[PDB]
């Protein structure tokens with residue numbers, strides 16, 4: 001019910017204050033605080049994002065919510081507690097982790113992502129699916145980014161919410177990320193209402209490129225204008241910012257922004273040049289990709305940029321389309 005959903009949100013918003021105190025003030029939180037500071041988190045950014053620490057006792061959240069008068073079973077359904085199935089007893093889901101609030105599209109805290117700071121697995125532990133937290137719907141930072149997305153008529157999608165935090169602080173505000181999932185049909189429906197222009201800047205590795213191709217292809221087929229920023233090999237946005245600084249980052253993101261078709265063919269360049277079967281198949285694929293582009297201006301530019309990869313004229317490529 002809506003009443004239950006609101007109670008679950010309250011639980012999240014109240015415990016956030018306790019996690020924040022635990023991180024910034026308590027002895028147990030000192031190592032986690034140092035870890036964040038070494039990753040460039042200022043006191044101000046930690047406060048701004050409401051970042052906290054979940055102690056390792058296994059009953060910190062449980063006892064707090066109990067004292068405040070919340071139903072324990074509801075706290076379990078809200079994803080803040082786990083249940084011992086042999087015992088039927090409850091305990092903290094999040095233990096010894098740095099706690100990043102996950103806000104919904106209206107800016108209410110509806111879940112947490114808890115990162116290890118001691119090399120434990122999983123690296124990140126999220127809230128489970130709950131009535132208020134759904135990974136196929138939530139986009140990290142969307143409530144904060146919405147204004148600039150509309151103003152700039154573009155959304156930028158990163159892999160990691162940490163990348164979003166760093167990018168935002170660096171000056172790139174129109175950024176969001178999923179919570180470790182493939183961009184959903186629901187996400188795309190949400191995004192389309194804000195803008196038709198989406199730029200993908202995933203990590204600079206094989207998995208990142210593969211995800212760029214898959215996600216970009218689907219966005220294109222869904223009728224969006226797709227762009228790609230290619231980070232240096234082995235780097236994600238947080239890592240680029242750390243190495244080159246804010247100004248270099250916001251300049252970089254403004255420089256080599258390629259239409260999806262141009263990015264795709266550049267990835268496939270060597271296979272096309274050596275494998276005649278792939279040559280034929282990718283010429284047809286790229287022809288189809290270009291045909292899907294809603295922008296007449298960018299469609300014509302893509303034709304000019306893609307044609308040389310096949311050693312054909314822009315006129316010949318246009319004919320194929």
Ligand SMILES: Nc1nc2c(ncn2[C@@H]2O[C@H](COP(=O)(O)OP(=O)(O)OP(=O)(O)O)[C@@H](O)[C@H]2O)c(=O)[nH]1
Pocket residue numbers: 115122123124125126159160161162163178179180181203236238
């Ligand atoms: N559920 C879950 N999601 C994860 C896990 N590890 C990574 N992810 C998700 O995948 C995204 C990208 O993975 P990474 O490239 O390792 O993210 P990252 O921002 O570089 O992580 P760090 O900089 O090391 O803090 C993360 O932001 C998470 O949303 C995990 O262990 N469990």
Ligand SMILES: [Mn+2]
Pocket residue numbers: 203205207208
């Ligand atoms: Mn990766």
Ligand SMILES: [Mn+2]
Pocket residue numbers: 159160203236
């Ligand atoms: Mn990364």
Ligand SMILES: [Mn+2]
Pocket residue numbers: 160162236238239
């Ligand atoms: Mn990273």
